[PDB]
Amino acid sequence: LDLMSGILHCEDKDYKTAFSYFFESFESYHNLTTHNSYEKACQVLKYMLLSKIMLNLIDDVKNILNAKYTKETYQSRGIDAMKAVAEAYNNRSLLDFNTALKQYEKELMGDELTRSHFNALYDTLLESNLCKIIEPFECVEISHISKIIGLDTQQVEGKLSQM
Amino acid sequence: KDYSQILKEEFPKIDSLAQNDCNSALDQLLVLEKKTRQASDLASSKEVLAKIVDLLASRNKWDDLNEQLTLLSKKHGQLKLSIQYMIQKVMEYLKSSKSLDLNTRISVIETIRVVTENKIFVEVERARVTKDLVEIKKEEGKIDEAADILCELQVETYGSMEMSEKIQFILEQMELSILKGDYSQATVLSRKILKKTFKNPKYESLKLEYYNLLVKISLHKREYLEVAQYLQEIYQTDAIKSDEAKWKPVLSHIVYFLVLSPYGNLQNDLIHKIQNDNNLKKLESQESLVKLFTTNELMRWPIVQKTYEPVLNEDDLAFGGEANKHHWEDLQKRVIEHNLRVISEYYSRITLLRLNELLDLTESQTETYISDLVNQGIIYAKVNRPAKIVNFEKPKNSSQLLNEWSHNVDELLEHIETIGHLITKEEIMHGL
Numbered sequence: 001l002d003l004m005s006g007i008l009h010c011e012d013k014d015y016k017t018a019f020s021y022f023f024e025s026f027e028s029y030h031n032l033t034t035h036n037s038y039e040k041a042c043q044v045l046k047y048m049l050l051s052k053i054m055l056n057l058i059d060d061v062k063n064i065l066n067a068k069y070t071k072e073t074y075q076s077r078g079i080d081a082m083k084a085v086a087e088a089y090n091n092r093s094l095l096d097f098n099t100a101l102k103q104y105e106k107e108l109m110g111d112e113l114t115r116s117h118f119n120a121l122y123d124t125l126l127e128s129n130l131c132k133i134i135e136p137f138e139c140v141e142i143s144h145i146s147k148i149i150g151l152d153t154q155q156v157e158g159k160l161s162q163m
Numbered sequence: 164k165d166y167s168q169i170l171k172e173e174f175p176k177i178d179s180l181a182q183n184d185c186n187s188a189l190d191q192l193l194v195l196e197k198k199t200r201q202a203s204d205l206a207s208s209k210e211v212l213a214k215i216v217d218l219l220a221s222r223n224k225w226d227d228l229n230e231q232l233t234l235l236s237k238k239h240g241q242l243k244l245s246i247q248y249m250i251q252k253v254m255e256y257l258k259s260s261k262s263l264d265l266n267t268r269i270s271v272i273e274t275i276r277v278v279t280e281n282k283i284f285v286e287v288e289r290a291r292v293t294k295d296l297v298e299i300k301k302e303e304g305k306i307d308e309a310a311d312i313l314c315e316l317q318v319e320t321y322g323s324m325e326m327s328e329k330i331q332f333i334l335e336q337m338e339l340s341i342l343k344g345d346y347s348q349a350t351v352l353s354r355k356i357l358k359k360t361f362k363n364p365k366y367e368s369l370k371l372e373y374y375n376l377l378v379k380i381s382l383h384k385r386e387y388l389e390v391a392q393y394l395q396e397i398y399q400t401d402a403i404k405s406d407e408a409k410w411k412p413v414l415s416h417i418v419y420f421l422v423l424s425p426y427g428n429l430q431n432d433l434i435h436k437i438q439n440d441n442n443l444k445k446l447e448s449q450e451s452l453v454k455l456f457t458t459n460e461l462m463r464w465p466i467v468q469k470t471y472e473p474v475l476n477e478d479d480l481a482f483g484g485e486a487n488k489h490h491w492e493d494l495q496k497r498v499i500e501h502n503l504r505v506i507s508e509y510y511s512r513i514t515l516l517r518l519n520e521l522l523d524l525t526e527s528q529t530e531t532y533i534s535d536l537v538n539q540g541i542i543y544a545k546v547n548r549p550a551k552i553v554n555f556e557k558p559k560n561s562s563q564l565l566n567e568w569s570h571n572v573d574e575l576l577e578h579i580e581t582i583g584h585l586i587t588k589e590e591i592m593h594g595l
Binding site (some may be wrong): 066132135136137138139140141144 | 347530533534535537538543544545546547548549550553
């Protein structure tokens with residue numbers, strides 16, 4: 001019941017409320033152990049980290065994966081896939097984001113529910129990628145920005161006037 | 164009384180195997196129990212109850228001896244505190260026998276329920292028993308089994324007992340945690356024993372572990388802010404137990420750590436240091452480089468960086484050395500930061516053609532380190548690509564420009580007031 005509660009909050013965002021149901025659910029699936037399938041507990045761990053990424057919090061994401069008592073018997077490439085995404089989201093670059101995007105697409109993106117979130121992060125991190133390019137303030141070349149991000153000129157200029 | 168006649172009680176059982184020794188211990192168990200119970204602290208002789216250990220030692224396996232301690236643990240044992248003096252007897256024949264009993268010694272520790280289960284903690288014995296089992300695991304090549312045993316022992320801390328020896332027990336897991344491959348486990352242990360021993364004076368053997376474990380954890384972290392902190396604390400304060408010949412070169416690595424760290428508040432403290440200027444020339448050579456932070460032109464630095472590396476690629480008393488690339492990996496990144504801080508505090512604007520010649524880098528490598536310092540909130544510089552210049556002047560509002568002008572007006576009144584009082588002070592020489 002608490003699992004499907006936070007899922008309905010994905011459309012209207014406001015992930016601070018959905019995180020309350022995701023945190024309380026992890027204690028329920030962890031106490032079941034052999035009484036249920038281990039795959040169900042792995043999906044709950046994904047909903048907690050992906051909800052904190054939308055809230056733009058780096059420390060709260062690293063407090064779980066780096067903690068050995070949070071994962072324990074639950075580990076896989078799909079769980080560690082969010083670690084590379086969190087590092088790419090913190091650095092705000094499409095180089096490390098797209099590197100693990102197509103590699104884990106058969107694992108991390110295998111869930112159609114969470115797939116809609118990565119599509120929003122495409123335009124979200126791209127606007128965040130421009131923040132790392134504008135670090136030397138103003139007086140930068142538009143053509144020089146397109147060569148760094150590696151996209152079309154019309155595609156970059158469309159996202160520059162958006163922000 | 165009856166305790167002095169124990170030698171003459173059984174004549175024949177001394178020269179034989181004496182299979183009835185198990186029955187003789189049970190007969191004395193019920194008799195001496197009613198005469199002591201929990202009333203008298205020390206009444207019955209501990210040697211009488213521990214005599215069964217000396218009866219069968221090298222003439223029988225230790226499996227039957229552990230069964231006798233199990234029955235005494237479940238029963239009263241003639242006293243409630245008698246178990247305290249029984250395990251003290253167990254620690255004698257262990258180191259005096261060895262031979263083929265080293266392999267069976269592991270089963271002896273695991274069989275005893277006092278060292279395993281938690282008790283009233285009158286022992287101050289089992290702490291060394293647990294360490295003996297871990298030393299066997301380290302000799303067998305198991306890094307994980309050695310660190311996991313002492314991890315649960317440090318959870319229960321005795322009230323007082325050993326003071327300086329207990330510190331070594333707490334610091335023992337920190338040494339085996341890094342060997343396990345995780346340095347984050349020893350971080351929690353450094354936040355407990357260090358605070359309690361901060362105000363207490365440490366002896367010679369106490370500070371030997373802090374000289375290593377404190378800088379060893381941050382060694383793999385590659386963070387030099389914590390390396391030059393805990394090291395200088397033990398170095399500057401006391402540290403008179405060591406030899407002054409090897410004590411001076413320790414400072415040579417301390418100054419080298421300030422360059423790899425993002426500056427610090429300890430740089431000016433070592434400039435006025437007495438022992439830093441004199442004695443070893445490497446101490447003054449690295450100290451002379453500290454005054455060059457503001458005057459850095461980057462011109463002569465790679466000449467020395469490629470020629471003289473006394474503390475750079477050669478480490479002895481601190482890091483012990485790793486590789487030539489590892490020590491120079493973060494070295495080149497800091498030297499660039501030393502130059503950019505000077506230009507930001509000197510040049511208001513400079514062309515990219517000249518800035519690349521001063522940094523000895525390309526166009527891509529130049530804007531890489533400059534843009535990284537902007538996000539860290541250190542240097543704010545506006546790079547002008549069309550003009551091919553970088554403006555280091557930060558913008559100021561109208562209130563900030565008028566505020567600094569107000570400090571000058573108040574400063575001019577100080578010079579007017581100072582000179583006003585100097586006329587009367589210098590009137591002695593003028594009116595002479």
